[PDB]
Amino acid sequence: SMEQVAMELRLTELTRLLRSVLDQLQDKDPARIFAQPVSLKEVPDYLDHIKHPMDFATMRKRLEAQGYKNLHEFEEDFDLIIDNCMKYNARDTVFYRAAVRLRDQGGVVLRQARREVDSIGLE
Numbered sequence: 001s002m003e004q005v006a007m008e009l010r011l012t013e014l015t016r017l018l019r020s021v022l023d024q025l026q027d028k029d030p031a032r033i034f035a036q037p038v039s040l041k042e043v044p045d046y047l048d049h050i051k052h053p054m055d056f057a058t059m060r061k062r063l064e065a066q067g068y069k070n071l072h073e074f075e076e077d078f079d080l081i082i083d084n085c086m087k088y089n090a091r092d093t094v095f096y097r098a099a100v101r102l103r104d105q106g107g108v109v110l111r112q113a114r115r116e117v118d119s120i121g122l123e
């Protein structure tokens with residue numbers, strides 16, 4: 001149906017916007033601390049602590065499968081990256097502090113993204 005095609009176009013447009021957002025967020029992580037899943041070789045007990053691991057590569061895979069239906073779902077995964085890190089690592093660590101900085105700098109990007117999704121009507 002034409003309605004189905006229209007819905008699919010909207011999702012493709014949302015995916016394009018979220019791709020730009022993801023690239024911008026990842027730019028705020030120049031150390032690439034959040035680029036890949038936390039290694040279970042370097043951190044053997046990680047899954048005893050963190051029940052829902054997340055990272056930018058995993059988000060990008062979901063993104064390109066058009067697996068984010070709205071901005072909220074995308075933000076939930078971004079928040080997991082940050083929140084997991086601030087639980088596993090102590091305040092004095094380079095890991096915790098990277099998550100704080102990514103959260104702060106990312107908030108700016110996500111604030112305008114919400115405005116764009118609403119205004120253009122992508123969900």
Ligand SMILES: CNc1cc2c(cc1[N+](=O)[O-])n(C)c(=O)n2C
Nearest residue numbers: 032033034038042043085088095
């Ligand atoms: C980039 N590498 C990395 C990233 C981590 C991490 C451990 C490593 N590691 O290599 O051992 N932990 C515990 C963590 O929370 N993050 C975000």
